[PDB]
Every structure is written in structure tokens, then in C-alpha cells.
RNA sequence: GUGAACCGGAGAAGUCAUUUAAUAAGGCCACUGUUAAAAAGUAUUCCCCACGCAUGUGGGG
């Protein structure tokens with residue numbers, strides 16, 4: 009839904025800096041540099057698995073702190089899907105079918121892999137000629153703002169990530185590289 | 187005009203206090219430096235230059 013809060017389109021991209029902090033290694037400014045019609049979907053698909061804790065609005069997502077993600081490789085895309093093809097007993101419920109779908113404590117694969125930790129609404133394209141700040145290809149239309157407001161997951165949810173790694177009690181094993 | 191361009195790991199700090207290397211020793215016994223010479227009674231003094239050439243005078247290194 010269209011929440012009244014307005015945020016720049018660069019908040020969904022981690023490598024591109026946003027409000028506060030610094031802007032070195034990526035010389036951009038808010039609301040003047042936008043995203044094309046593919047990088048917006050790139051940012052949208054990154055929501056359920058790489059959502060950071062943040063400041064106020066500590067609730068990150070179904071995995072809290074993002075852990076290591078391990079999966080088996082191949083040499084072709086159709087081949088790549090075969091190694092990691094592990095159907096479960098129940099295929100949960102759709103979470104991208106236009107339904108927010110308040111479920112029970114136990115969740116499923118289709119409702120887990122497509123989580124939406126934040127309400128998101130993208131504004132209409134703006135005419136122009138400039139390129140985006142992620143892939144850099146010149147285009148005709150760009151998106152410059154979005155409506156983002158934080159949402160907390162229900163406490164005590166039961167969900168084991170198929171590609172996650174846990175230490176001893178379900179706590180996420182992150183990367184301790186500084 | 188190159189995952190590149192633009193870019194300090196920076197500010198600060200007595201290792202100070204105590205201590206004999208001390209007590210002793212013979213380097214001792216043996217050994218010719220010997221055999222040879224005039225600085226002076228010579229027969230060409232190692233080199234240059236003036237003169238007329240009866241084992242000639244003068245001058246300089």
C-alpha cells in the first residue's frame with residue numbers, strides 16, 4: 009500500500025550510499041540519481057534474504073542477521089536448478105500473489121522465500137536520458153523515489169532457511185570479517 | 187580519465203631500587219762466531235770546448 013513516508017530509491021541498494029553516513033566510492037546524491045527498469049527489480053528481489061538490522065526499526069527479517077548462503081554450483085542455468093531441487097512436503101502458501109496473507113506460526117517455502125520485511129511502493133518513471141547508478145546503461149526512464157516503512161516479523165516464528173547456516177541454536181552464522 | 191579518479195591511523199608514557207670473584211704456585215739444568223784483506227810507487231779518469239797538433243796546455247760538469 010502507498011504509505012505516506014517517502015524515501016530515496018537508493019535505500020534498497022546497499023552498495024550505493026543513502027542519507028546520513030558518507031558518499032565516498034560512489035559519487036551520487038539523493039533524488040537526482042535514479043534506477044532503470046531492471047535494477048529496481050534487482051533491489052526488489054534482494055528484500056527477503058539480505059535485509060540488514062538497521063537503526064530504529066531493528067526487526068530485519070526472517071533470518072535477522074544475514075548468514076552465509078551455501079548452494080551447489082553447475083555450468084548451466086537449467087543444470088544449476090537440478091542440484092538444488094529439493095521439494096518439501098508442503099509448498100507453504102504464495103506470498104507474492106497480491107495477498108499479504110497473515111499465516112500461522114508455521115510457515116512454508118513459497119511464503120518463506122518471498123518474504124516482504126518492508127512495505128514498498130515504487131513511483132512512476134520520469135522521462136529523461138541519463139543512466140542509472142547501479143548498472144550504468146543509458147536509458148529513457150528512471151525511478152527516483154519510493155515509499156518504505158519498516159514492519160516487524162511476528163516473534164517466535166518457525167522457519168528453517170533451506171540455504172542458511174546456524175551455529176548451535178538457530179542463531180545465524182554471519183561473516184566475522186572486518 | 188585503468189572496480190578507476192578524489193584519499194594522514196592519528197594524539198601519550200623515567201624500567202627505577204640491592205651486590206669483592208675471592209684464598210696458591212721458581213720456567214728450571216747445556217752452548218767459540220770461527221778462518222780474510224795496502225785507500226795508495228802509477229802506465230786510460232765517466233763526459234763537453236778554444237788553439238797550432240813532437241807520450242799539448244787552458245775552461246766547465
Ligand SMILES: [Zn+2]
Nearest residue numbers: 044047140143
Ligand atoms: Zn541499471
